[PDB]
Design a protein around this ligand. Structure first.
Ligand SMILES: CCCCCCCCCCCCCCCCCC(=O)OC[C@H](COP(=O)([O-])OCC(O)COP(=O)([O-])OC[C@@H](COC(=O)CCCCCCCCCCCCCCCCC)OC(=O)CCCCCCCCCCCCCCCCC)OC(=O)CCCCCCCCCCCCCCCCC
Ligand SMILES: CCCCCCCCCCCCCCCCCC(=O)OC[C@H](COP(=O)([O-])OCC(O)COP(=O)([O-])OC[C@@H](COC(=O)CCCCCCCCCCCCCCCCC)OC(=O)CCCCCCCCCCCCCCCCC)OC(=O)CCCCCCCCCCCCCCCCC
Ligand SMILES: CCCCCCCCCCCCCCCCCC(=O)OC[C@H](COP(=O)(O)OCCN)OC(=O)CCCCCCCCCCCCCCCCC
Ligand SMILES: CCCCCCCCCCCCCCCCCC(=O)OC[C@H](COP(=O)(O)OCCN)OC(=O)CCCCCCCCCCCCCCCCC
Ligand SMILES: CCCCCCCCCCCCCCCCCC(=O)OC[C@H](COP(=O)(O)OCCN)OC(=O)CCCCCCCCCCCCCCCCC
Ligand SMILES: CCCCCCCCCCCCCCCCCC(=O)OC[C@H](COP(=O)(O)OCCN)OC(=O)CCCCCCCCCCCCCCCCC
Ligand SMILES: CCCCCCCCCCCCCCCCCC(=O)OC[C@H](COP(=O)(O)OCCN)OC(=O)CCCCCCCCCCCCCCCCC
Ligand SMILES: CCCCCCCCCCCC(=O)OC[C@H](COP(=O)(O)OCC[N+](C)(C)C)OC(=O)CCCCCCCCCCC
Ligand SMILES: CCCCCCCCCCCC(=O)OC[C@H](COP(=O)(O)OCC[N+](C)(C)C)OC(=O)CCCCCCCCCCC
Ligand SMILES: CCCCCCCCCCCC(=O)OC[C@H](COP(=O)(O)OCC[N+](C)(C)C)OC(=O)CCCCCCCCCCC
Lengths: 75, 80, 491, 90, 506, 192
């Protein structure tokens, strides 16, 4: 699951990299900045995957009831 | 008769005259609630009317405060 | 692999180019090394990415099987199922090949901001290349409309004197119509609950609901392959867009509309396609005859080629709606052959003359075969190819498309044969004027075609004459793919 | 190698099974391409006879000319969408 | 947590000395309070438990998973707005010190968030009128928070009068409902949903339609948004629609029980008319805020089609659209608050008077932003391209999802008009992109030192001096890539909206 | 759906505090020191005026601690409440709750406590404070009354579960428990 947080972190690097252009500064300015923006989105990316996995469990159970209701309709 | 919008003839040509029409308009809502509540012997309608009178008062105070500062903003030379 | 390698590498390339150019902005003025020679290093990296994109698809062309019916190279990336069949493979090959040529055409004829131009050109090519390899209407539409954002900016930033009118035309014409294609895509998602190609190919709809969806989709197609009376955007945009934007807007963007028929109309709306085919022929035959006659009265050099583009695309639509293999194979070969001859003319007209004299009016140019002989050899050679001379790849496309038109409808489909005569009227008049009489008194003797502009011409002519002499290269890929598009019950 | 056609009909399968439906479409395409290949062979026989007979081409090439003009309308690619989506019995 | 901290901020602010640093520091105390509120809310409130719907405070307030979605959204958008007033939007003391001149700014905002978050939850006509006033009174005060400004005070006076008439219509509908049934609780009214005049609920909607600026009432909203300070317009043109459109959706959920067609025709008459004015209106405008006021009306027209249709796909269309439209709105206004540093300075003709309340006021003040700051110009381009509906941005999926809900319910006429109205509106979104970039190549090599940003002092001349503050830049970049790259996680987000229920169940 | 045993639909305020886990106190402590830190973190992120870090004045840090003192308690209060409602892990509290109630019924005292509030006032109080923690992020409201509408069946405290019989508590029939609805309307049917 680390690769999923790897992608989220790399999105965090892009935002800090895209922030430099808006501020018009060299892309090597304050290298600790890229770490903070990376870790911020891994925290978001960690929670985001928790939210989506939670959605899968809820949606599987709801669909169990929806399939039964359709069968009553399809009688 | 009022379908030709007669009430527009009855509202004066000052910002303060609009404020009064809003109060007279809301006054009709409260009187309607008191009418229903008493006939039904329902105090919940009277709770509503009490809230409407209190809320209609707060609306007046804010509107007048805006109007008052609107007035002094023009008369704001104060260079004497 | 394919799409995943095709997106990730291009995104990496786009990020790399942006990082290199924008590093020095800062608070101080910058005179760096990357600006030297007109951003030459940054233009090179853009040109390499165009060449590498071709290498990605060839890695997957080797694995392609010509005797397998069905989509190959199927993969899922971004919750979207992709894949390739016979028809889609060749159009992808054409799209990526025009990549290096579109960039090379604008090598030293922009006032600046070459890095922005190079990124946009590689971005438009990828978006159009990916449009042939998706497997649902929604994803087709997403890629069909995403090209407006760079193309609208590119034409506005880099355009000619009327670039504001041209930008306001491509953005609104191709959006106010493609939104009608969105409605029919949505209705597919409401009744069937899916927009996947295979899933919707097997469903039959009521003949009233077939007529609605067809009208919506063909509205979005009749603008991209400009059919009269909604063709007014193309001549304007061509005459004002940058030269590289004209190569893509004519080489590829028009062929996305013929591919729109192959995916969105013939398989799933087969019953209602039979009904509209008589009407489609009427619109296309009138497009063929009117566009040819209108070209006879034009004055801008780059408009004249623009209308010649409309006449050929009308023939392509005539062939593809013929319900036989002859018409369908001919229409697709013509789209490939037109995909090289059409860009070549804009190089001759808006890329070689316009980069020397900066005027597109026809009145200034005559007798060009005196002090510019190499230019007049290619103008003569490409004039014939543009008019279906038997040795070129256009004749194979046009003859089959005309043959397929007569097979489908002997009476009115025969009027497609007027394409052979009319195409020689406006075109040969333009060439005969340019390379005839004494050299013009308004121009001044200058260089003939440069070595770069020869390279562009030779590699748009070479593919054209291979397909003409031996078109079975295209056919061996198409045959099993194009045979799944035919609707007929014989008893 | 030489792949064998999956001889399968639209009338014996369930279209819900999109794997079998694919074979019914692929099998109906392959048989048609055989008829064109059969047709191109028959036309070759006609060409030898006419070249070889000369004046007698009307006689020595009588049934080949008759058969070729009979197979021509139906020995062509027609696709599968016609028969998949239509029911001749009804 | 919101209410308790508000009292502490009210008392504390009235004690300490009037200064900008303390005013800006108190604005950073509110940014904590809103953050703390979100952590406590998300802790106790869950989608899995609020699915059934839970009555609170003697059934006055009813909360379910549909309302709960918007409360968290409202809290989030209120964090992104407070970041503007709590940090530097430009860093130039002259332009920025306006945000810190008022100490009750953050207090009034905290008043409104209590008003906004409780409105979707109302379940009694007695508390419906009270809560709608708590939200309505907070907006008038915020519109007049800059009491020195002549235009601001003139707008609050216009806002108060229109809202007062709007609130009276809302109050009169509830009274009429009480007259027929004698019941105040909304659930008790549902027992008589077939026995009451369903048009008295429509008179309730006509009051809520005024407060969201829907035609024919659109006139005042366009005037108000084009007169208030850009920091104020950034709040009052988005927040009321977040909490009122959620309420309108619920009221329409109850209304469609009896499925009265006459009710739907009148609302379709207003939706159809609003698309016309929302599209053709913005064609001939010079002020950017007037342009975004017509843009706002058109998007509200789209969001009502999802509300009017009111099916299972309408929840998904509304829930997704209301989220993406808020982020797009914040992103656009945040950029307009920043790019004012690139305005030129005179050393003449047309005598254009600019003030510190709206330094960026005209569309042609965006000229050559492709030159002065290319990275932020693309961010504005991506944001505008989302409003146009170019895929695969967030804006496309909003229109695509709205169309599904609209056509699935037979609204063919409105679906076609919205697709005509979208293309007509593309003309005036394209003008913003025309001004941003089209004159780049003529101005490429120009001698520019008269910009407002060139009056900033030089600190050291050795260290790197970024032009834009840190926090505002990170917000613009984050919301620009979320708009651009929604295709990556779109499937998860949409499947995360299937679960938001409003008494669907089974 | 993570569901557990419903200990109390409307837990009393004094009960909710007495049931804080050590981790709940940690959250209250973290919230108390988080708000002053968040002010400092912002200054490290971006100075309020000027361009260099400057510690905010001590007065702001005192008001920041108070704001985070309530917020930490509110987060602690809501987390402790989820256990009572069954939304969270409540096995540890269930035994602790059962020990108190079984002891309470044994002494013939009411589990819910004696109340100054009359029957209508008890039931009215329950309506206001039931499910009131869902909006505890907006405004506060606590169950500070000894009412009887807690959403449980007092029969379930008679059966013995694992590890409970060792308590050797004697439970009388509910009809003899002081201050219960089943033990009050003995003379008149409308007066307790
Ligand atoms: C008690 C004094 C007090 O709490 O604060 C001292 C505070 C400081 O006075 P000061 O000397 O002028 O402050 C100068 C500092 O610069 C002012 O700045 P400061 O930082 O030194 O103090 C401001 C204070 C913030 O002040 C408050 O929040 C008081 C809120 C009360 C309302 O922030 C804190 O110090 C936090 C610790 C105390 C807050 C109490 C929170 C729990 C509520 C009790 O004085 C007050 O604010 C008095 C407010 C009390 C009014 C009477 C309320 C009566 C209500 C009950 C009557 C019926 C029963
Ligand atoms: C925008 C709109 C904004 C709206 C919101 C605005 C603000 C409103 C929210 C404020 C609160 C709303 C509720 C107020 C209305 C309800 C008043 C009411 O029910 O009166 C009946 C109630 C009498 O009912 P009861 O049946 O006799 O119940 C007796 C005890 O209340 C309960 O007996 P017990 O079994 O729980 O324990 C007795 C003993 C505790 O016994 C123990 O078990 C020991 C616990 C160890 C100590 C725990 C830590 C103490 C707190 C930390 O003493 C206590 O600690 C009771 C808790 C009260 C302490 C302070 C509560 C502060 C909450 C605020 O009147 C009171 O005694 C209330 C006393 C608290 C004063 C009100 C608190 C707010 C001031
Ligand atoms: C460093 C590690 C990168 C992240 C690796 C990872 O987590 O895998 C996710 C995915 C790999 O692919 P997979 O999981 O097999 O399935 C397809 C899902 N994209 O890989 C990814 O999802 C990365 C793709 C993100 C980059 C593409 C961004 C798309 C931008 C718009 C393209 C235009 C489309 C129209
Ligand atoms: C520069 C060149 C530009 C392009 C070239 C333009 C010419 C191409 C279009 C003309 C195509 C050739 C003419 C079409 C008819 C020739 C085929 C034919 O023989 O038609 C016969 C057919 C039925 O034959 P029949 O047996 O007589 O009818 C009774 C059936 N039991 O059906 C008929 O009876 C047809 C009746 C006569 C044909 C009427 C339509 C002719 C085309 C008029 C177009 C006017 C413009
Ligand atoms: C900052 C953004 C913080 C996002 C926090 C969202 C969140 O925590 O709740 C997500 C919510 C799902 O919550 P729920 O389904 O009710 O159950 C789980 C609760 N524990 O999901 C929801 O339904 C909330 C709906 C609103 C979501 C808005 C999307 C967030 C936008 C991100 C903005 C990022 C801006 C950059 C921040 C820069 C900071 C300097
Ligand atoms: C006790 C209630 C008031 C707290 C006051 C005690 C205090 O924390 O002092 C403030 C602290 C150090 O005091 P200081 O100003 O540096 O010394 C005098 C110099 N003229 O300056 C600081 O650094 C602030 C430290 C705050 C410590 C927590 C304060 C909690 C206040 C109670 C909240 C609940 C009521
Ligand atoms: C807060 C103080 C809490 C301590 C307290 O004094 O309240 C408890 C008190 C209980 O009194 P008690 O006679 O034991 O009730 C049971 C009788 N069957 O409760 C009472 O009887 C009266 C409670 C009054 C305390 C409220 C005063 C606080 C200010 C109100 C705002
Ligand atoms: C100047 C630069 C210009 C632009 C350059 C392009 C940058 C590309 C960055 C690559 C990042 C990457 O790879 O992201 C990979 C990661 C994790 O993917 P995963 O673990 O498989 O999760 C599942 C993904 N599926 C479905 C593909 C399998 O997804 C992301 O973070 C998604 C980006 C965030 C989008 C916003 C949605 C979340 C917020 C919700 C509020 C509405
Ligand atoms: C495959 C899809 C990937 C997604 C790509 C997203 C684009 C964002 C790129 C930002 C980089 C940047 O802002 O950099 C700017 C770069 C390069 O500018 P330059 O000439 O070097 O600098 C100029 C100034 N100088 C020379 C003085 C230093 O130009 C671009 O932006 C070009 C590509 C984007 C244009 C169209 C955007 C439309 C978005 C909607 C599409 C559906
Ligand atoms: C568990 C992971 C937590 C990560 C940290 C989160 C808090 C950030 C504070 C870090 C310290 C700091 O602010 O350091 C300071 C830096 C640099 O500032 P600069 O622009 O160079 O200013 C000039 C600095 N001088 C004075 C030295 C010249 O700021 C940053 O880089 C801010 C990064 C943006 C915040 C990322 C949050 C992402 C949110 C995602 C959820 C939606």
């Amino acid at each position: 699951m680390i690769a999923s947080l790897a992608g989220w972190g790399l999105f965090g690097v892009t935002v800090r990299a895209y922030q430099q252009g808006i501020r018009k500064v060299p892309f090597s300015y304050y290298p600790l900045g890229y770490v903070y923006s990376a870790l911020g989105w891994v925290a978001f990316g960690y929670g985001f995957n928790l939210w989506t996995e939670r959605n899968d469990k809820l949606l599987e159970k709801r669909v169990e009831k929806l399939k039964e209701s359709r069968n009553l309709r399809l009688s | 008769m009022d379908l030709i919008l007669l009430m527009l003839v009855a509202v004066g040509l000052n910002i303060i005259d609009i404020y009064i029409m809003i109060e007279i308009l809301i006054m009709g809502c409260t009187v309607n609630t008191i009418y229903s509540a008493s006939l039904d012997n329902d105090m919940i309608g009277l709770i509503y009317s009490l809230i409407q009178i209190i809320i209609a008062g707060v609306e007046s105070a804010i509107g007048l405060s805006i109007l008052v500062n609107y007035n002094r903003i023009r008369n704001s030379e104060e260079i004497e | 692999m394919l799409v995943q390698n095709l997106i990730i590498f291009n995104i990496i390339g786009i990020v790399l180019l942006v990082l290199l150019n924008n590093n020095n902005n800062g608070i101080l003025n910058k005179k760096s090394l990357l600006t030297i020679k007109n951003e030459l290093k940054l233009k090179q990296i853009g040109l390499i990415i165009s060449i590498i994109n071709i290498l990605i698809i060839i890695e997957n062309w080797i694995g392609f099987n010509s005797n397998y019916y069905g989509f190959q190279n199927i993969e899922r990336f971004l919750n979207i199922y992709w894949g390739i069949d016979g028809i889609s493979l060749l159009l992808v090959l054409l799209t990526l090949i025009l990549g290096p040529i579109a960039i090379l055409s604008n090598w030293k004829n922009l006032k600046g901001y070459y890095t922005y131009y190079v990124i946009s050109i590689n971005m438009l090519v990828i978006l159009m290349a990916l449009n042939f390899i998706c497997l649902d209407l929604v994803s087709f539409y997403i890629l069909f409309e995403s090209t407006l954002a760079p193309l609208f900016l590119l034409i506005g930033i880099y355009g000619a004197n009327n670039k504001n009118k041209a930008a306001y035309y491509v953005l609104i014409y191709t959006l106010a119509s493609s939104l009608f294609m969105l409605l029919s895509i949505v209705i597919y998602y409401i009744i069937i609950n899916s927009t996947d190609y295979i899933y919707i190919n097997n469903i039959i709809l009521s003949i009233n609901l077939q007529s609605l969806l067809f009208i919506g989709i063909i509205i979005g197609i009749a603008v991209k392959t400009p059919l009269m009376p909604v063709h007014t955007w193309l001549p304007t945009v061509h005459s004002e867009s940058p030269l590289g934007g004209s190569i893509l807007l004519a080489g590829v963007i028009l062929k996305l509309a013929i591919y729109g028929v192959i995916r969105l109309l013939l398989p799933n709306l087969s019953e209602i396609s039979m009904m509209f085919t008589p009407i489609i022929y009427i619109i296309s035959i009138l497009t063929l005859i009117y566009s040819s006659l209108i070209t006879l009265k034009q004055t801008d050099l780059k408009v004249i080629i623009a209308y010649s583009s409309i006449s050929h695309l009308a023939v392509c639509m005539i062939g593809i709606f013929a319900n036989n293999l002859i018409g369908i194979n001919g229409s697709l070969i013509l789209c490939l052959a037109h995909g090289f001859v059409s860009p070549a003319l804009f190089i001759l007209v808006g890329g070689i003359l316009y980069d020397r004299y900066h005027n597109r009016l026809i009145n200034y140019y005559q007798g060009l075969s005196t002090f510019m002989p190499i230019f007049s050899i290619y103008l003569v050679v490409f004039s014939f190819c543009n008019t279906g001379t038997p040795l070129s790849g256009n004749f194979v496309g046009e003859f089959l498309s005309i043959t397929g038109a007569v097979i489908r409808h002997p009476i009115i489909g025969s009027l497609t044969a007027a394409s052979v005569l009319l195409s020689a009227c406006y075109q040969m008049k333009l060439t005969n004027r340019l390379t005839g009489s004494v050299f013009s008194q308004y121009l001044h003797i200058t260089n003939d075609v440069t070595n770069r502009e020869i390279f562009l011409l030779n590699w748009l002519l070479i593919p054209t004459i291979i397909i003409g002499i031996y078109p079975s290269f295209v056919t061996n890929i198409l045959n099993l793919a194009s045979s799944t598009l035919i609707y007929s019950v014989l008893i | 190698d030489h792949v064998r056609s999956p001889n399968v009909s639209f009338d014996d399968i369930d279209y819900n099974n999109s794997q079998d439906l694919h074979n019914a479409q692929e099998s109906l395409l392959r048989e048609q391409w055989i008829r064109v290949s059969a047709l191109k062979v028959c036309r070759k026989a006609l060409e030898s006879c006419y070249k070889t007979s000369g004046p007698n081409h009307y006689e020595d090439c009588r049934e080949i000319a008759e058969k070729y003009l009979n197979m021509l309308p139906d020995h062509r690619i027609q696709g599968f969408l016609g028969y998949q989506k239509n029911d001749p019995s009804k | 947590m919101l209410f308790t901290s508000l009292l502490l901020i009210i008392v504390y602010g009235s004690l300490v000395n009037k200064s900008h640093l303390l005013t800006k520091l108190i604005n950073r105390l509110g940014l904590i309070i809103i953050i703390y509120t979100l952590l406590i809310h998300l802790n106790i409130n869950t989608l899995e438990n609020l699915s059934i719907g839970i009555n609170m405070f003697n059934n006055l307030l009813l909360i379910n998973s549909f309302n709960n979605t918007i409360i968290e959204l409202i809290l989030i958008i209120c964090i992104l707005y407070v970041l503007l007033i709590s940090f530097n939007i430009t860093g130039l003391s002259i332009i920025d010190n306006l945000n810190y001149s008022k100490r009750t700014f953050i207090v009034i905002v905290l008043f409104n968030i209590i008003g906004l978050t409780l409105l979707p939850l109302v379940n009694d006509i007695m508390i419906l009128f009270i809560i709608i006033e708590l939200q309505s009174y907070s907006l008038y005060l915020l519109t007049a928070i800059f009491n020195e400004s002549h235009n601001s005070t003139k707008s609050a006076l216009y806002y108060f009068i229109v809202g007062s008439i709007a609130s009276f219509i809302i109050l009169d509908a509830t009274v009429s409902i009480y007259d027929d049934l004698g019941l105040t609780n909304i659930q008790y009214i549902l027992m008589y949903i077939d026995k009451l005049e369903i048009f008295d609920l429509l008179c309730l909607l006509f009051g809520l339609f005024i407060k969201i600026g829907l035609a024919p009432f659109y006139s005042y909203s366009i005037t108000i948004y084009s007169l208030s300070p850009t920091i104020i317009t950034n709040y009052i043109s988005l927040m009321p629609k977040l909490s009122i459109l959620t309420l309108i959706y619920i009221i329409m959920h109850y209304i469609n029980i009896v499925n009265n067609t006459d009710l739907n025709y009148v609302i379709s008459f207003l939706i159809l008319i609003s698309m016309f004015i929302g599209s053709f209106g913005g064609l001939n405008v010079i002020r950017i805020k007037t342009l975004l006021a017509y843009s706002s009306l058109l998007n509200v027209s789209y969001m009502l089609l999802a509300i009017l249709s009111n099916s299972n796909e309408s929840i998904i269309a509304y829930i997704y659209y209301i989220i993406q439209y808020s982020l797009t709105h914040i992103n656009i206004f945040s950029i307009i608050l920043v790019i004012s540093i690139y305005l030129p300075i005179m050393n003449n003709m047309l005598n254009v008077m600019i003030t510190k309340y709206s330094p960026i006021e005209y569309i042609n003040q965006l000229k050559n932003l492709f030159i002065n700051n290319i990275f932020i110009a693309i961010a504005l381009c991506i944001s505008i391209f989302s409003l146009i509906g170019i895929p695969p941005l967030t804006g496309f999926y909003g229109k695509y999802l709205v169309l599904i809900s609209g056509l699935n319910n037979g609204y063919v006429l409105l679906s076609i008009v919205l697709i005509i109205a979208s293309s007509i509106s593309t003309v005036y979104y394209a003008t913003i992109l025309k001004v941003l970039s089209f004159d780049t190549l003529s101005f490429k090599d120009i001698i520019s030192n008269n910009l407002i940003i060139n009056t900033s002092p030089e600190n050291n001349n050795n260290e790197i001096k970024p032009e834009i503050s840190n926090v505002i830049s990170y917000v613009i970049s984050s919301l620009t890539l979320i708009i651009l790259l929604i295709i990556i996680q779109y499937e998860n987000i949409v499947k995360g909206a299937y679960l938001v229920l409003l008494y669907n169940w089974v | 759906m993570e569901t557990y045993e419903l200990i109390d639909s409307d837990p009393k305020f004094s009960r909710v505090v007495r049931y804080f886990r050590p981790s709940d106190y940690l959250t209250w402590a973290l919230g108390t020191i988080g708000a002053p830190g968040l002010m400092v973190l912002f200054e490290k992120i971006e100075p309020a005026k000027g361009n260099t870090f400057k510690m905010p004045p001590p007065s702001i840090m005192r008001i920041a601690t108070t704001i985070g003192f309530f917020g930490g308690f509110y987060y602690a209060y809501t987390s402790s409440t989820k256990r009572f409602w069954g939304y969270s892990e409540n096995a540890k509290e269930v035994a602790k709750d059962r020990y108190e109630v079984k002891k309470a019924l044994s002494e013939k005292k009411s589990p819910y406590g004696s109340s100054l509030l009359n029957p209508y006032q008890q039931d009215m109080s329950a309506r206001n404070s039931t499910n009131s923690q869902l909006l505890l992020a907006i405004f506060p409201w606590f169950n500070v009354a000894n009412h009887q509408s807690h959403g449980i069946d007092l029969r379930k405290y008679y059966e013995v579960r694992d590890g409970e019989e060792n308590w050797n508590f004697t439970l009388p029939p509910l009809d003899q428990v002081k201050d219960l609805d089943v033990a009050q309307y003995k003379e008149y049917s409308n007066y307790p």
